[model samples]
Target chain A: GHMAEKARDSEDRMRQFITDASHELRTPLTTIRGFAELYRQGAARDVGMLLSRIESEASRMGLLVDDLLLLAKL
Target chain B: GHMAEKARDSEDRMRQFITDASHELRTPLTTIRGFAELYRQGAARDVGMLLSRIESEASRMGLLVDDLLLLAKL
Candidate 1:
């Protein structure tokens, strides 16, 4: 019974990690896609601002990916 | 029941974050202290090499602290 409890604890920890990873990944992705949709609709007319926002979000995603890789390595 | 479950989930996540932060902080700290001890014992003959290692480890600690602060904000 103790061994089974430990197994369930590990499973819960794994699920938590996955949930955190998905949440972190989705935030930047949503921002990037939201800006793209706005640009497509001509809502954001300033090309420079639009591109800058996109690049910023992309860089954020890149950092998150790097962090995920580091976490995986750990 | 659902609210209780959600509270427990948040508590688990917070505990996990603290655990991770502590581990990350401990690593660089251990390296820094280990190098200091070695230098004190005259085990490291090259002063410059010892100092460089200390500096690098300190930098790592700085970044880790920044990440922890960001995590707190989140």
Candidate 2:
């Protein structure tokens, strides 16, 4: 039962943990995707050779968001 | 922003739904397996010599409970 910790604001603790975890995940992921799109579209350079690399980074960012959602809701 | 749908108490509703779904799955599942075990091992003797049938039913019950727990946690 983990009874010792059960009554000591556990629900709030868990919710806060989930919220913080989601934010931590979202921050870098959103930043990376943001930069990738920016760099792809000539914010950094009109570098067609880097488009696939940008897309790959964006996909990784999407997967990270998906995992965070599962952890929070599951 | 989904402005019209904001601040709708949606979190509480989703939590309630997840709890109810878990309970509904566990109830009849437990009952069928409980009685099926009782029905085996001579609890309902003279109904028939149905030992193999009882084993099959018990196995099926086990599968149902396994699926229910998997779904709940997953």
Candidate 3:
């Protein structure tokens, strides 16, 4: 299995981009997850159509891409 | 402009999601930026249309949402 390589790849990439934050390293997976939550919340509230609108227009590839990618990997 | 309010909102949201990483609180903005670079890179190789496919169908609302949100705020 290339699991080790893939893990290392993400780790290396994380480290490489970690500096971009300037506040210290972190898990970006959590970052996107929160972004997802923001939409889900908005989707249920004021934007009433945030999620549905997003799904309708972006099922081809969109925010769900990352969340889903993380899910598939996890 | 409700700059202060919006700032606090994001700060609050960030704090709420911070514990998720279990690695001290950090900036998620950078998290998404690197994600941008990742796609930009993938868009250059392997996936010929990573960027195009993304832009083609996600402009209405997508990963660019946060990046653009942060940009607008910044």
Candidate 4:
């Protein structure tokens, strides 16, 4: 009686968690995305190599999202 | 030999996961702190009712950190 049923609350909670986490994840993601986009535009001449670093963070964000989604499904 | 190397890598990766998860936890903690501080300053009404919400999330964050720390030290 005390615990909210997972079907009723946890599903919604996980959805909200994804939304909130997306905000948190996307801030850093946008930072990395911006740098990569900038490098693609040739704005930073010697920083072509920095794209790899940005890509790595992008990958990490992607993995985090995937994990969140999986957790939500659980 | 490969299995041994993978075991070592897994341990390091788990610590890195703790560090990353800590960052994720702290970002939301800052928001919670900001809101609680606002309530403390009378910026919002229904301040008395916030204790439960604040306590719930503060407890969630604490448990998460404890779990992650245990994993890191494993």
Model 1 regions more than 4 Å off:
A1-74
Model 3 scores what on Cα lDDT?
A: 0.34
- Residue-wise C-alpha lDDT for candidate 4, range A1-74, written one tens digit per residue: 22323232443443344345545565654555465455446475644244345435545654664565445334
Clashing pairs in 4: none
Window of ten residues with lowest summed lDDT in model 2 chain B: B1-10
- For each candidate, the alpha-carbon lDDT, in order, equals 0.54, 0.40, 0.34, 0.49
DockQ versus reference, model 3? 0.02
Better of 1 and 2 by DockQ: 1
Residue-level lDDT of model 1, residues A1-74, one tens digit each, is 45445544644554455456545645544554465567667786864454455445444544544464455344
Tens digit of lDDT per residue, candidate 1, span B1-74? 55555555665565566557556655654565566566556576764565466556555655565555456555
Cα miss at A41, model 4 (Å)? 60
What proportion of true contacts does candidate 2 retain? 0.00
For model 4, the superposed segments whose C-alpha errors exceed 4 Å read A1-74, B72-74
DockQ versus reference, model 1: 0.02
Indicate the residue-level lDDT of B29 in model 4.
46
For candidate 2, write residues A1-74 as lDDT tens digits: 24333423444344454445434434433443454455435465532333334334334534543454355465
Candidate 1: Cα lDDT at A43: 81
Candidate 1: Cα lDDT at A41: 71
True contacts kept of each: 0.00, 0.00, 0.00, 0.00
Interface RMSD for each predicted structure:
15.6, 20.4, 17.5, 17.7
C-alpha root-mean-square deviation, each candidate: 17.1, 22.6, 19.6, 17.7
Query: What TM-score would each prediction reach against the true structure?
Result: 0.49, 0.32, 0.19, 0.41
lDDT of 4 by residue, B1-74 (tens): 45445454554454355446656655544544565567656787753244344444444554554555455334
